From a paper:
The prosurvival protein MCL-1 prevents apoptosis by binding to the pro-death BCL-2 family proteins. MCL-1 is a prosurvival protein that mediates malignant cell survival across multiple tumor histologies. The large, hydrophobic, shallow binding groove of MCL-1 has presented substantial challenges for identifying effective small-molecule inhibitors of this protein.
The macrocyclic core structure of ABBV-467 serves to orient the molecule into a highly active conformation; this is evidenced by the reported target affinity and potency against MCL-1-dependent cell lines, as well as the durable in vivo efficacy observed following compound administration. ABBV-467 is a potent binder of human MCL-1 (dissociation constant [Ki] values < 0.010 nM) and demonstrates lesser affinity (Ki values > 200 nM) toward the other BCL-2 family members BCL-XL, BCL-2, BCL-W, and BCL2-A1. Consistent with published reports of MCL-1 inhibitors, ABBV-467 is highly selective for the target protein. Treatment of H929 cells with ABBV-467 induced the classical hallmarks of apoptosis, including a dose-dependent loss in mitochondrial membrane potential, caspase-3/7 activation, and phosphatidyl serine externalization. Moreover, deletion of the BCL-2 effector gene BAK in MCL-1-dependent SKBR3 or SU-DH-1 cells completely inhibited the activity of ABBV-467. In summary, the molecule ABBV-467 is a highly potent and selective MCL-1 inhibitor that demonstrates robust inhibition of tumor growth in in vivo models of hematological malignancies.
Numbering used by the authors: -191 to 320
Write the structure that this text describes.
């Protein structure tokens, strides 16, 4: 047995390695803390084939997409163990009724300022530009933060009223997507104004900013608790405080809760359980990681009660209280691409903020209408009857793509019925992981091949043959998770092709 733990390079990995070394001394078992590049991207590729780490570490927002793929194993955390962590932290790691990952710590962006340069932090975002005038006079910069990640810019975009998905009575509504509304256009406009008014360069990354503030070159930065240790080490006189206001209202950061999930493919499930509950999630386990790089408002009540007495944590918690817990819906991986692209094209000057935000909002519309078209076809091909409920935006286009899918998709199923049958029988998809396995196989078979409407219809028709065969054994709960993945490989990995082919209109045009 062994334990391979993947965790982001910005988190305390040497501290976690000390926790695994402490576990190593009591079990023999080697714990290996690797911190790979583009972790949120690499984990899904490897763990789909069943080649990942035993324990994965990321903010909860990506775990809901991992669970739909079946890249995660369900955790069995005893009734007594759950009472040791905060109820809201367990809620962040709950997907479709099931706890999929372990809550570690609540993370939220706070404003970090140098007390020597600024005796006080500015109450508003609108007073940061004129501060730069008086700070440049002394050879300095007023504010520098990561402009590459939309996580760092979201609190300004969300302050006046921008949002990912609205929380309609215990659920997210993918029809109500506010990345285009006036509050987002106003927030992002102020950021673009700072680059137009030379107050900020539209190329500052995590390292540029961490160097600048910690060297004493910039007056304030934006960051999470993980960055505290490097400021502490730089000996800079700093204060962590509430984020400034935009247009009178607070900056609402997206609030992530660092989670610890176990690969479903992994053969060290019970080993990861003892490691996570009995070793890591204890005051001494979290104090070891926290000593390397601060976690934030930790899930563990025992250690959080102590940690609460730190005004840096109180600022973090007040900022978390003024922001929102990020959704864990599968669309989130795709949502972030759309939004990173928008923040990067607005700052880079490649686009107007109305355009950059539109192509981003449009990206969610392609995801919604696509999940609607695909799932409708697939569900009606198992029941044998149409759904009569409305579809919203681009309704007549989605209506025609369905009557186009029924004609062309049933032609593919008919003309290739002999072949589809052999493929479905040569797989023995009996249980849910076997079905989710297929989801990934067709996802990568289509992708590692040419992108055209022919192959799209083929991939969807096979999905409808599968939806018919799922129904046969009553475990037809995988139809929508299958329909949402075919949407993902399409609007996520082939976004540009679909947009170049005039969306679903080009498909209805294609076959006539
Ligand atoms: O910026 C988009 C990005 O935001 C979040 O990632 C944060 C993460 O939560 C922090 O712990 C830290 O690692 O910084 C990241 C931003 O660089 C989402 O979790 C992530 O999925 C998303 O792509």
């Amino acid at each position: 047995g062994k334990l391979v733990i993947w965790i982001n390079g910005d988190k305390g990995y040497n501290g976690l390695a000390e926790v695994g070394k402490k576990f190593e001394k009591d079990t023999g078992i080697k714990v290996t803390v690797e911190h790979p590049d583009k972790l949120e991207e690499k984990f899904p590729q490897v763990a789909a084939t069943g080649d990942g780490p035993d324990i994965i570490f990321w903010a909860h927002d990506r775990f809901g997409g991992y669970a739909q793929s079946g890249l995660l194993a369900e955790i069995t955390p005893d009734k007594a163990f759950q009472d040791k962590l905060y109820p809201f932290t367990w809620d962040a790691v709950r997907y479709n009724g099931k706890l999929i990952a372990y809550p570690i710590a609540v993370e939220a962006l706070s404003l970090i300022y140098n007390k020597d340069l600024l005796p006080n932090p500015p109450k508003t975002w609108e007073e940061i530009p004129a501060l730069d005038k008086e700070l440049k006079a002394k050879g300095k910069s007023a504010l520098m933060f990561n402009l590459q990640e939309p996580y760092f810019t979201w609190p300004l975009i969300a302050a006046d009223g921008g949002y990912a998905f609205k929380y309609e009575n215990g659920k997210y509504d993918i029809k109500d997507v506010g990345v285009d509304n006036a509050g987002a256009k106003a927030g992002l406009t102020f950021l673009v104004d700072l680059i137009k008014n030379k107050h900020m360069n539209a190329d500052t990354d995590y390292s540029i900013a961490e160097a600048a503030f910690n060297k004493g070159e910039t007056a304030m930065t934006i960051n999470g608790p993980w960055a505290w240790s490097n400021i502490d080490t730089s000996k800079v006189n700093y204060g962590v405080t509430v984020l400034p206001t935009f247009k009178g209202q607070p900056s609402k950061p997206f609030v992530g809760v660092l989670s610890a999930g176990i690969n479903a493919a992994s053969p060290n499930k019970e080993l990861a359980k003892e490691f996570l509950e009995n070793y890591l999630l204890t005051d001494e386990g979290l104090e070891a990681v926290n000593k390397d790089k601060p976690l934030g408002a930790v899930a563990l009540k025992s250690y959080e009660e102590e940690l609460a007495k730190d005004p840096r944590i109180a600022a973090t918690m007040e900022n978390a209280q003024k922001g929102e817990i990020m959704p864990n819906i599968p669309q989130m991986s795709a949502f972030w691409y759309a939004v990173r692209t928008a923040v990067i094209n607005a700052a880079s000057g490649r686009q107007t903020v109305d355009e950059a935000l539109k192509d981003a909002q449009t990206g969610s519309e392609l995801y919604r209408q696509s999940l609607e078209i695909i799932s409708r076809y697939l569900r009606e091909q198992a029941t044998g009857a149409a759904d009569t409920a409305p579809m919203g935006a681009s309704g007549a286009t989605s209506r025609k793509a369905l009557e186009t899918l029924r004609r062309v998709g049933d032609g593919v199923q008919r003309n290739h019925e002999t072949a589809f049958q052999g493929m479905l029988r040569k797989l023995d998809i009996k249980n849910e992981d076997d079905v989710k396995s297929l989801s990934r196989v067709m996802i990568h078979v289509f992708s590692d091949g040419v992108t055209n409407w022919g192959r799209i219809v083929t991939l969807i028709s096979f999905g409808a043959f599968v939806a018919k065969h799922l129904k046969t054994i009553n475990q037809e709960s995988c139809i929508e998770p299958l329909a949402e993945s075919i949407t993902d490989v399409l609007v996520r990995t082939k976004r540009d092709w679909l947009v170049k082919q005039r969306g679903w209109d080009g498909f209805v045009e294609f076959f006539h």
